Amino acid sequence: ESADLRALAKHLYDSYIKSFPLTKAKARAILTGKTTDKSPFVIYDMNSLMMGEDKIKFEVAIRIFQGCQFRSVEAVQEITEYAKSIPGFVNLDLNDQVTLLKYGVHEIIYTMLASLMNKDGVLISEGQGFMTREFLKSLRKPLGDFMEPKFEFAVKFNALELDDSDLAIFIAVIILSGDRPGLLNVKPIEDIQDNLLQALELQLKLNHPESSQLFAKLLQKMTDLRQIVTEHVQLLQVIKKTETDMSLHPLLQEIYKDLY
Amino acid sequence: ESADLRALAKHLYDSYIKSFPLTKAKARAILTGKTTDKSPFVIYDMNSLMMGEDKIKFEVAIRIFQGCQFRSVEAVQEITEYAKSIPGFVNLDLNDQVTLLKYGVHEIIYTMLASLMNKDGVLISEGQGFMTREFLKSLRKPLGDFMEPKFEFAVKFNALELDDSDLAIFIAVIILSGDRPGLLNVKPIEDIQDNLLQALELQLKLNHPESSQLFAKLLQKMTDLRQIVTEHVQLLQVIKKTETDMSLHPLLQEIYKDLY
Ligand SMILES: O=C(O)[C@H](Cc1ccccc1)Oc1ccc(-c2ccccc2)cc1
Ligand SMILES: O=C(O)[C@H](Cc1ccccc1)Oc1ccc(-c2ccccc2)cc1
Numbered sequence: 434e435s436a437d438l439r440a441l442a443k444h445l446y447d448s449y450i451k452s453f454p455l456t457k458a459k460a461r462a463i464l465t466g467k468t469t470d471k472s473p474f475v476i477y478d479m480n481s482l483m484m485g486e487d488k489i490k491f492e493v494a495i496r497i498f499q500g501c502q503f504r505s506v507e508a509v510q511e512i513t514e515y516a517k518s519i520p521g522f523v524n525l526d527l528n529d530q531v532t533l534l535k536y537g538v539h540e541i542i543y544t545m546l547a548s549l550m551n552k553d554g555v556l557i558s559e560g561q562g563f564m565t566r567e568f569l570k571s572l573r574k575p576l577g578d579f580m581e582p583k584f585e586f587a588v589k590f591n592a593l594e595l596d597d598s599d600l601a602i603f604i605a606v607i608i609l610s611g612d613r614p615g616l617l618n619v620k621p622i623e624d625i626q627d628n629l630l631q632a633l634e635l636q637l638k639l640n641h642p643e644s645s646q647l648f649a650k651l652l653q654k655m656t657d658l659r660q661i662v663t664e665h666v667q668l669l670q671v672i673k674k675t676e677t678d679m680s681l682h683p684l685l686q687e688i689y690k691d692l693y
Numbered sequence: 694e695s696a697d698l699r700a701l702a703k704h705l706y707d708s709y710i711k712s713f714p715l716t717k718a719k720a721r722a723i724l725t726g727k728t729t730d731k732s733p734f735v736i737y738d739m740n741s742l743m744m745g746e747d748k749i750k751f752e753v754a755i756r757i758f759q760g761c762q763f764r765s766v767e768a769v770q771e772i773t774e775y776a777k778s779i780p781g782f783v784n785l786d787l788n789d790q791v792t793l794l795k796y797g798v799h800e801i802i803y804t805m806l807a808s809l810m811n812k813d814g815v816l817i818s819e820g821q822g823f824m825t826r827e828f829l830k831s832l833r834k835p836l837g838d839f840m841e842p843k844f845e846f847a848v849k850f851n852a853l854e855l856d857d858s859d860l861a862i863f864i865a866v867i868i869l870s871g872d873r874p875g876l877l878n879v880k881p882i883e884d885i886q887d888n889l890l891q892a893l894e895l896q897l898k899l900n901h902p903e904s905s906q907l908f909a910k911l912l913q914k915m916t917d918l919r920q921i922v923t924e925h926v927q928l929l930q931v932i933k934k935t936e937t938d939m940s941l942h943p944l945l946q947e948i949y950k951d952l953y
Contacts, residue, residue: 509945689949
């Protein structure tokens with residue numbers, strides 16, 4: 434039933450657009466900067482970082498880690514809004530909604546971060562700035578280990594050349610994964626996901642004449658994301674046990690884990 | 694040894710001032726607004742909230758809860774910086790530093806929030822605005838329950854009339870509490886705290902001729918703070934189990950608890 438699968442595709446796209454201010458279209462407009470309006474400021478050394486403070490909405494590694502922490506609090510609200518717009522979702526068991534969002538959230542953060550990334554760096558500060566990969570690599574040891582797996586993921590992911598209409602569906606599919614630990618009622622989740630998968634396959638055929646095997650490749654990427662989440666959690670766990678400077682400890686995370 | 698206890702008092706005061714941008718002196722200057730420069734905008738109904746968006750750095754209840762979430766990520770860094778400045782602290786076992794900060798942090802957030810509060814409301818947005826207690830009480834049910842215990846604590850706490858020099862020591866004493874669960878080496882912590890307690894008693898005698906029993910009253914307040922943290926955690930735990938709107942779930946907290 435393809436009228437329905439198309440209507441669902443559009444519905445997903447319109448909520449994505451409402452929920453997520455910084456889209457792939459916006460990010461690529463800057464990176465393909467014909468639109469010189471927002472030609473981004475390039476932070477490529479300590480010098481240009483220092484100059485860039487007087488023209489962006491801002492130990493450099495600590496700043497960056499806290500930047501990630503702040504971004505997570507914002508991203509959760511965006512993702513939660515979008516999740517609620519997925520037909521069927523708010524009708525699920527309250528505990529399953531929680532479970533699905535809990536595991537979906539970081540997988541989606543990295544999916545969307547890739548929109549801002551290429552092999553040379555990442556857009557920062559609502560696209561105002563471009564921070565160089567080699568600049569990041571030159572910083573304090575833990576920073577680099579954190580970013581490089583994400584870059585590597587993003588280079589392979591971006592070579593699939595998805596647009597925002599593609600991403601809306603992919604992201605919904607991720608949320609509606611019926612194999613999350615602790616799920617109570619798996620069949621209704623699988624039902625919604627099966628229908629989302631068909632909507633995704635059809636969308637990819639329509640939007641991509643320049644490639645085949647895009648659907649399969651994309652489903653492999655949902656597995657890769659689970660690995661990236663896991664490596665990330667584990668780097669943080671090494672820091673928690675071994676880092677001697679308390680300002681480099683996550684810590685808010687250690688508090689919510691143990692006290693809350 | 695009172696030259697030392699005074700030098701320590703000053704050392705603590707200077708780091709407090711470096712670590713914490715918004716002080717009690719600043720907050721009281723606004724609330725005793727002879728300095729009309731920053732006479733705060735009063736959000737006292739929905740109408741004045743709506744007008745106040747066009748003159749402050751900003752469902753209203755969700756905005757407020759996320760505001761608290763953002764503030765926590767900022768506060769942890771301030772508090773960690775200050776903790777490191779307390780003589781003896783960075784020489785403790787790494788695990789004990791972690792433990793002390795983990796339990797100290799929320800107790801200090803509420804201690805300092807009181808600086809912004811009176812029985813009629815709370816300073817918001819770096820003191821730019823004053824949000825009314827009765828306005829908060831009129832909002833969505835969970836909001837009110839969250840704030841009222843903090844107001845009640847803050848009214849009794851503020852009636853002790855401490856200044857920033859007093860607070861610096863009190864806060865250090867809190868961090869250096871030797872009864873936190875999981876501490877490895879308790880005696881060195883107790884040693885530093887005993888000396889901080891003397892510095893605190895002497896400070897209070899010198900700074901407060903208009904009251905006696907201030908030291909005792911203040912130590913009772915360290916126990917009260919533990920209750921406020923506990924009630925807070927428990928309200929969040931009720932929301933996690935019973936709230937049907939996912940946008941009203943903490944959730945970042947649920948993710949760090951279960952996945953990290
Ligand atoms: O785990 C998370 O929620 C975020 C996820 C994220 C990763 C990259 C961009 C945006 C978000 O990653 C973090 C990385 C480092 C830290 C952190 C913060 C302070 C001190 C040390 C590490 C916190 C979160
Ligand atoms: O627990 C915390 O870290 C903060 C503590 C805090 C409380 C008042 C002012 C500043 C900080 O309190 C929160 C209160 C509500 C929420 C929250 C966020 C989103 C959805 C529901 C609740 C998060 C934190």
